[PDB]
Write a protein that binds this ligand. Structure first.
Ligand SMILES: CN1CCc2c(-c3ccc(S(O)(O)N(C)C)cc3)cc3c(c2C1)NC(=O)/C3=N/O[C@@H](CCO)C(=O)O
Ligand SMILES: N[C@@H](CCC(=O)O)C(=O)O
Lengths: 257, 257
């Protein structure tokens, strides 16, 4: 029985409204829930879904240099695999094995429909329409370390923008965009931006291209034999068109706009 | 001195206009020539840019079960690493090592302006306008192993159409689209499709969205010690935004069309 570590993140892994009457992996539904099922069938193994304790994805603490989240639960032999929207990064790659990305993404711009913004350069060229990110995370860090002119300017603006353009959560960012009457833009993951875009009141949308390129990947303990079989699974699921099917399923079929 | 095998596919790898007045790797230019320079810089090693002998990307022969193109040169010990627009595929993942994707792409359609086609389905619904792909390419491998209605049908057509709708090289396919008077559509990766569309004589065009989603990856023989190093360098060059830089530098459209 393979211990699968994941995290509650809609539409990846969520609990059904009636998860009370259900039990086991049946309580959950979502993109990663179906993917986990597909990976297990192509690899031939029984799995049990568990939610990462600290609700973190994976980061090494500067102080204790200890890994937390789903990445930590892997490097310390607590879980056999990680099936969630885990982004493939250098530091992470160094401590765990990553299969080829099962979904692409990148920092994108979320504006309230009607907002006269077309790209990142447009935002950096003005201030009448405030824009921000999470007051903590990779999105924020992305600008704090960007050598690109457009992004470097955006960082200077944001860090000195008044009132504060940083939000504490994704919910706050989305709500602020919906309440600012087109006077505020939020920078978040494309997958999450295009997901909200399919949710009523349907007043938001993604604009322009992503400011960068990332990709989620299934993770296994560095050196785990299970990693190879899972990688081929991903590639096969992608080639057969299944990954595009699961995407269209939880993002558009269940759409609302 | 690491031996790097690559293919002349512009804007990835091309021979400088005055290459005869040059020598060494300095003879070439392109996205992959730069990427290679960066990979070698970080991994710390000398290299030589060799061109794939049989001028193919890679494909296994059903009967002999022998690989050709770059995949072959890596499998049979002819090259230490492959730095070119090599598509990461299941069948290739099984015989060679791949680094995480350094660039994304998807099969697309190239046509001569005025061609009554604007989607893969349109082509699959007729025969007046012939269409094929590149030999020993991942695109041809796609349709052949595809079980997705439209694609499965397109494959059947292709291997039954007369004369042969297939071509030996990308240029051979592009030239056919321009000379066929619209009586031939070419299926090639969007990356190469969009580049050529912004170039003279400005007679080709990309229609409809891509048919799939994947990405090019750095390849090395299985077990190769370069694998890890190169992979981490790829993830770093991405996080540093170096990949996007090269992407914008070589795909920069100076409005010829
Ligand atoms: C599809 N999306 C959904 C949200 C999300 C969040 C995420 C979680 C909470 C929130 S919040 O509730 O609004 N908040 C700010 C508390 C916002 C974003 C964080 C991470 C992530 C994803 C995937 N993938 C990662 O690799 C990752 N690393 O995350 C890193 C930390 C940040 O870089 C890690 O956990 O190591
Ligand atoms: N990228 C393909 C070649 C181009 C194509 O098939 O259109 C490969 O690596 O085989």
């Amino acid at each position: 029985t393979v211990v699968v570590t994941t995290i509650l993140e809609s539409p990846y892994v969520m609990m059904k409204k009636n998860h009370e009457m259900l039990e086991g992996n049946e309580r959950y539904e979502g993109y990663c829930v179906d993917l986990a099922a597909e990976i297990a069938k192509h690899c031939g193994f029984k799995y049990k879904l568990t939610i990462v304790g600290d609700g973190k994805y994976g980061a090494r603490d500067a102080d204790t240099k200890i890994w937390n989240g789903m990445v930590g639960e892997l490097v310390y032999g607590k879980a056999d695999i990680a099936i969630a929207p885990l982004t493939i990064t250098l530091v992470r790659e160094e401590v765990i094995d990553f299969s080829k990305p099962f979904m692409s993404l990148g920092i994108s711009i979320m504006i309230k429909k009607g907002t006269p913004i077309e790209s990142a350069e447009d935002l950096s060229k003005q201030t009448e329409i405030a824009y921000g990110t999470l007051d903590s995370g990779s999105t924020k860090e992305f600008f704090r370390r960007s050598k690109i002119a457009v992004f470097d300017k955006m960082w200077t603006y944001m860090r000195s923008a008044e009132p504060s353009v940083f939000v504490r959560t994704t919910a706050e960012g989305v709500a602020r965009v919906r309440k600012s009457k087109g006077k505020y833009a939020y920078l978040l993951e494309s997958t999450m931006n295009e997901y909200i875009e399919q949710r009523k009141p349907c007043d938001t949308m993604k604009v322009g291209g992503n400011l960068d390129s990332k990709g989620y990947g299934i993770a296994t303990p560095k050196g785990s034999s299970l990693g190879n079989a899972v990688n081929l699974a991903v590639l096969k699921l992608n080639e057969q068109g299944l990954l595009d099917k699961l995407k269209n399923k939880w993002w558009y079929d269940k759409g609302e706009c």
